[PDB]
Design a binder for this molecule. Structure first.
Ligand code: HEM
Ligand code: HEM
Ligand code: HEM
Ligand code: HEM
Ligand SMILES: [C-]#N
Ligand SMILES: [C-]#N
Ligand SMILES: [C-]#N
Ligand SMILES: [C-]#N
Ligand SMILES: [C-]#N
Ligand SMILES: [C-]#N
Ligand SMILES: [C-]#N
Ligand SMILES: [C-]#N
Ligand SMILES: [C-]#N
Ligand SMILES: [C-]#N
Ligand SMILES: [Fe+3]
Ligand SMILES: [Fe+3]
Ligand SMILES: [Fe+3]
Lengths: 146, 141, 141, 146
C-alpha cells in the first residue's frame, strides 16, 4: 500500500488516538450483526442471538482487540503486508475456510466504526487514505497469489 | 429481504436524518469520488474537482429518491422504475459502484449520527441499500 | 428483480426440466462439493461420496424447493420462509456458497439441456436463483 | 494454477476439441446477456438490446475469438499466468477500470459454455479442473489491483 507522506501522517495521527478496547469490539461486533452469516465462524464465542448479545459478548470484545492489533501490525509494515500476514491468511483460508469477500466486509465495517468514533475528523480525505489501508489488509489476508 | 424490524430501523433513521438528507447524499458522493476515483467516469460532465453545486444538487436528488424508497420500501420496483430505466437500461452502471456509494453513505451517517447509528440500524440500512441497489441495477420491464 | 419475460422463461425452462429436476439437483451438489470442497463443511455428517444416496435424496429436496419457488415466483419470501429459517437463522450459510451452487446448477442444466439452455434462459435462471439465494440468506420475519 | 499431470492432460484434451470460431463468442455473448452492465464496456459494438441481438452480433463473435486466444495462452503456461496476462491486466484494470468480479463472471460463463458444448464429457472432475483454470486467469487479469 502506497500512501503519500501527507496520508501516512494523517492515518497514523488518527490511529494513535484509537481506543483499541472499544473500537476493536465494536468493529467485530458490527461485522457479526451487519453480516449475520459471519457468526457461524464464531460459534464457540457463545451467545450471538441478538444485537445486544453480540455487542456485549466478552469473547467478541476481546477478539476484536486482537483484530485491531493485526491492523496495527499492518500499518507499521505497509510495504510488507503479505509477508506480515501470510500465516494469518493460511489460518483464515485453509483452516477456517473464510471466503475472501468477508475480509473486505470487515475492512468496511472498521471504516464505518472509525467514522462513528471520530465524526467530522474522519474527513473524505482521511477515509480515502484508510480505504487504501483496509484494501491492502484484505488483499493480504485473501492472498490470491499466482 | 427486509424484516419488519429493518423497515422500522430505516424509517426511524432516515426520519432523523430529515432535511440533512440532501447534504448527506452530497457528502456520500464526494466520499465515493475521492475514495474510489473510477466512479467519476460516470459523471464526465459534472464538476467533480470538489463538492460543487452540481454535486450538492445531485446529492439532493439521490436523497429524495432514497426518501421515496424508505417510504415505499415494500413497493420499490414500482416506486423506482424510472431510476431502474436510467441506471440499468441507459447508464448500465456496474453493481460494484452501488456497493461503493452505499458504503460511503453509511460512513457519512456514522460520522454525523454517532448515537443513532447503532449496530442494528447499521445492519438494516445496509440491507436496505442493497435492495435499492438491486432494483436500480435490474431490468424488469 | 425479475421481469415478466424472466418469469415466463423460468417457468418454461423448469417445465422442460420436468421430472429430471431431482437428478439435476443432485448433480449440482456433486459438482459443487468437488469444485468447491469447502462447501462440504456444511454437511459434516453426510456421506458425500460420489453417487451417495444421501446426496441424491438431498438433491431432490433442493429441486422440490426450486419447483415451489417457480410456482410462487411472485411471493418467494412467503413461500420460502421455512428455508430462510433454516439457511439464514439456523445454518448461517455464507451467501458466497449460494453463488457456487447456483453456478453448478446452471452448469448441470447446460450439460443436460443444450438446446433449452439459451442465453435468455441462462439470464433469467441466473436472476431467479440469485433472488432465491437472497431470500434464503436473509432474516426477514 | 496447480493441476495434476492428469488434470492437465484432461483439460488440454478437451480444449483441443473446442470450436475456436464459436465458443469464445458464445461466452462473451452470454456474459453480455446474463450480466447486462458489462455491455457498457462494449458500446462501440452497437445494438446489444436483446439476447438475439447480442448473440448474432458479428463484433461479439469476433471479440470472443480474442478472449478464447487468451485462454489458450493461459493453458499453455499455467505456471506463469501473471506474466502472460501482464499487459492484458494493465488494459483491463488501469485503462478500462473493469471491476475484478466481472473477470470471475466471464470465467464462470465460459465454464457454462464448455458444459453446454461437451455435455456428458464435461464431468464434475473436468469442471473442477477448469474452475481452477478460470480462477487463475481471472486472478492474473486482476493483478494490477494487487
Ligand atoms: C480482514 C481482517 C481480519 C483480520 C486483520 C483478522 C485477524 C485475526 C487474528 C489476528 C486472529 C487471531 C489468530 C491468532 O491468534 O493467530 C483471527 C482469528 C479468527 N478470525 Fe480473523 N481477521 C480478519 C477477518 C476475519 C473474517 C472476515 C472472518 C470471518 C467472518 C474471520 C474469522 C476468524 C476466526 C473464526 C478466527 C478464530 C477465532 C477463534 O476461535 O479464536 N476473520 N483473526
Ligand atoms: C443508492 C443508489 C443510487 C440512487 C438512489 C441514485 C439515484 C439517482 C437519481 C435520483 C438520479 C437522477 C434522475 C433525474 O434526472 O431525476 C440519478 C442519476 C444518475 N446516477 Fe444515480 N443513484 C444511485 C447510485 C448510482 C451509482 C452507484 C452510480 C454510479 C457511480 C450512479 C450514476 C448516476 C448517473 C451517471 C446519473 C445521471 C447524472 C446526470 O447526467 O445528471 N448512480 N441517480
Ligand atoms: C438454490 C439454493 C438452495 C436451496 C433451494 C436449498 C434448499 C434446501 C432444502 C429444501 C433443504 C432441506 C430442508 C428439509 O426438508 O430438511 C436444505 C437443507 C440444507 N442446506 Fe440448502 N439450499 C440451497 C443452498 C444451500 C447452500 C449454498 C448451502 C451451503 C453450502 C446449503 C446448506 C444446507 C444444509 C447444511 C442443509 C441441512 C442439511 C441437513 O443436515 O439435513 N444450502 N436446503
Ligand atoms: C476471463 C477474462 C477476460 C479475458 C481473458 C479477456 C481478454 C481480452 C482480450 C484478449 C482482449 C483484447 C485486447 C487487444 O485487442 O489487444 C480484451 C479486450 C477487452 N476486454 Fe476483456 N477479457 C476478460 C474479461 C473482461 C471483462 C469481464 C470485461 C468487462 C465486462 C472486459 C472488457 C474488455 C474490453 C472493453 C476490451 C476492449 C474491447 C475493444 O474496444 O476492442 N474483458 N479482453
Ligand atoms: C477476526 N475476527
Ligand atoms: C501477487 N499478486
Ligand atoms: C503475492 N503474494
Ligand atoms: C508475490 N510474490
Ligand atoms: C506478485 N507479483
Ligand atoms: C504473487 N504471485
Ligand atoms: C447518483 N449519484
Ligand atoms: C442444500 N443443498
Ligand atoms: C473481453 N471480452
Ligand atoms: C504480491 N505482492
Ligand atoms: Fe504471497
Ligand atoms: Fe419472492
Ligand atoms: Fe497478483
Amino acid at each position: 500500500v502506497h500512501l503519500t507522506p501527507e496520508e501516512k501522517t494523517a492515518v497514523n495521527a488518527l490511529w494513535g488516538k484509537v481506543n483499541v478496547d472499544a473500537v476493536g469490539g465494536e468493529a467485530l461486533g458490527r461485522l457479526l450483526v451487519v453480516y449475520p452469516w459471519t457468526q457461524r465462524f464464531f460459534e464457540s464465542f457463545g451467545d450471538l442471538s441478538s444485537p445486544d448479545a453480540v455487542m456485549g459478548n466478552p469473547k467478541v470484545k476481546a477478539h476484536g482487540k486482537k483484530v485491531l492489533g493485526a491492523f496495527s501490525d499492518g500499518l507499521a509494515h505497509l510495504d510488507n503486508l503479505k509477508g506480515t500476514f501470510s500465516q494469518l491468511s493460511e489460518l483464515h483460508c485453509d483452516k477456517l475456510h473464510v471466503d475472501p469477500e468477508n475480509f473486505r466486509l470487515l475492512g468496511n465495517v472498521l471504516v464505518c466504526v472509525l467514522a462513528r468514533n471520530f465524526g467530522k475528523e474522519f474527513t473524505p480525505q482521511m477515509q480515502a487514505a484508510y480505504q487504501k489501508v483496509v484494501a491492502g489488509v484484505a488483499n493480504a489476508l485473501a492472498h490470491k497469489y499466482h | 429481504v427486509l424484516s419488519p424490524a429493518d423497515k422500522t430501523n430505516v424509517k426511524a433513521a432516515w426520519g432523523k436524518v430529515g432535511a440533512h438528507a440532501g447534504e448527506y447524499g452530497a457528502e456520500a458522493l464526494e466520499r465515493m469520488f475521492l475514495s474510489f476515483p473510477t466512479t467519476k467516469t460516470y459523471f464526465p460532465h459534472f464538476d467533480l474537482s470538489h463538492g460543487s453545486a452540481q454535486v450538492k444538487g445531485h446529492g439532493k436528488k439521490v436523497a429524495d429518491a432514497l426518501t421515496n424508497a424508505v417510504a415505499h420500501v415494500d413497493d420499490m420496483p414500482n416506486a423506482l422504475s424510472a431510476l431502474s430505466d436510467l441506471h440499468a437500461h441507459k447508464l448500465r452502471v456496474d453493481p460494484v459502484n452501488f456497493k461503493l456509494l452505499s458504503h460511503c453513505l453509511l460512513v457519512t451517517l456514522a460520522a454525523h449520527l454517532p448515537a443513532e447509528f447503532t449496530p442494528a440500524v447499521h445492519a438494516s440500512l445496509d440491507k436496505f441499500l442493497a435492495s435499492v441497489s438491486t432494483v436500480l441495477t435490474s431490468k424488469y420491464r
